Design an enzyme around this catalytic site. Structure first.
Site, PDB file in Angstrom:
ATOM      1  CG  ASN A 134      -1.862  -1.097   1.218  1.00 31.22           C
ATOM      2  OD1 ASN A 134      -2.806  -1.110   0.374  1.00 31.22           O
ATOM      3  ND2 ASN A 134      -1.648  -2.064   1.997  1.00 31.22           N
ATOM      4  CE  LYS A 175      -5.555   6.767  -1.618  1.00 31.60           C
ATOM      5  NZ  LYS A 175      -4.850   7.293  -0.495  1.00 31.60           N
ATOM      6  CB  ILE A 207       0.242   6.379   2.361  1.00 31.48           C
ATOM      7  CG1 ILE A 207       1.626   6.679   2.932  1.00 31.48           C
ATOM      8  CG2 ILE A 207      -0.503   5.400   3.322  1.00 31.48           C
ATOM      9  CD1 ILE A 207       1.663   7.461   4.236  1.00 31.48           C
ATOM     10  CB  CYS A 208      -2.622   3.071  -1.582  1.00 34.52           C
ATOM     11  SG  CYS A 208      -4.205   2.672  -2.382  1.00 34.52           S
ATOM     12  CG  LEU A 209      -4.832   4.868   4.839  1.00 33.36           C
ATOM     13  CD1 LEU A 209      -5.171   3.356   5.124  1.00 33.36           C
ATOM     14  CD2 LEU A 209      -3.702   5.398   5.670  1.00 33.36           C
TER      15      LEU A 209
END
Length: 147
Positions: A76, A89, A83-85
Site C-alpha cells: 500500500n 482521500k 500511501i494508498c489509504l
C-alpha cells in the site's frame, strides 16, 4: 495559527500514541516530521520509519498530505513513499484528525491490504506469496529503517 492546529500539535507532542512521534518543522507550523516504529510481529519490527505530513490551507475540509520518507516493501506504499489509504482521500472527513491518520498508518504496517492499489507489482508479490514478500520487507527493514 488556527486554534485546531495548535490543539492537535500539543496533543501529539504531549500525549503521542505509543510508537509514534509527530513534531512540526521549525517555523513551518503546517509541516510535521513523523517517526513511526515498525509494529511487533511484522517484518518492520525494529525499524523506525520517517514520514512527513503537510496540513494544506483548506485543512480540515481537505485531508493532511502524508508520505513515507523511508524506503519500505509494502503493498500500500509505492516507490515514491505514497500511501494508498482511503481516509487520506475520499473517506477523509473533518471529524477525523491527524492522530487518526497516524494510528491508521501504524496499523497499515500490521494489516496490509494487497487489493487496494490499481497497479502495484509489490502488491502482486504479497498476494502470490505473502511469507516470501515478507522476506524482502524484513531485509529492507534492516537496511533502510535501522538508522
Amino acid at each position: 495559527i488556527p486554534r485546531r492546529i495548535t490543539k492537535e500539535t500539543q496533543n501529539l507532542a504531549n500525549e503521542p500514541p505509543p510508537g509514534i512521534m509527530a513534531v512540526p518543522v521549525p517555523e513551518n507550523y503546517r509541516h510535521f516530521n513523523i517517526l513511526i516504529n515498525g509494529p511487533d510481529g511484522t517484518p518492520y519490527e525494529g525499524g523506525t520509519y520517517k514520514l512527513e505530513l503537510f496540513l494544506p490551507e483548506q485543512y480540515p475540509m481537505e485531508p493532511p498530505k502524508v508520505r513515507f520518507l523511508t524506503k519500505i516493501y509494502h503493498p500500500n506504499i509505492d516507490k515514491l513513499g505514497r500511501i494508498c489509504l482511503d481516509i487520506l482521500k475520499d473517506k477523509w472527513s473533518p471529524a477525523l484528525q491527524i492522530r487518526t491518520v497516524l494510528l491508521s498508518i501504524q496499523a497499515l504496517l500490521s494489516s496490509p491490504e494487497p487489493d487496494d492499489p490499481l497497479d502495484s507489482k509489490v502488491a502482486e508479490h504479497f498476494k502470490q506469496d505473502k511469507n516470501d514478500a515478507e522476506h524482502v520487507a524484513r531485509q529492507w527493514n534492516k537496511i533502510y529503517a535501522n538508522n
